[PDB]
């Protein structure tokens, strides 16, 4: 069930991308 594992860890790693977009939006 690799798809389920990738869903759990993907939301965690996604914070890097979301944080980058939040930072550039302020600039």
Curated annotation (Swiss-Prot):
It is a single-pass type I membrane protein. It comes from the Viruses. It is found in: Virion membrane; Host cell membrane; Host endosome membrane. The chain crosses the membrane at residues 5-24. The mature envelope protein (Env) consists of a homotrimer of non-covalently associated gp120-gp41 heterodimers. The resulting complex protrudes from the virus surface as a spike. There seems to be as few as 10 spikes on the average virion. Acts as a class I viral fusion protein. Under the current model, the protein has at least 3 conformational states: pre-fusion native state, pre-hairpin intermediate state, and post-fusion hairpin state. During fusion of viral and target intracellular membranes, the coiled coil regions (heptad repeats) assume a trimer-of-hairpins structure, positioning the fusion peptide in close proximity to the C-terminal region of the ectodomain. The formation of this structure appears to drive apposition and subsequent fusion of viral and target cell membranes. This is Transmembrane protein gp41. It comes from Human immunodeficiency virus type 1 group M subtype B (isolate HXB2) (HIV-1). The chain holds residues 683 to 704 of 856 of the full protein.
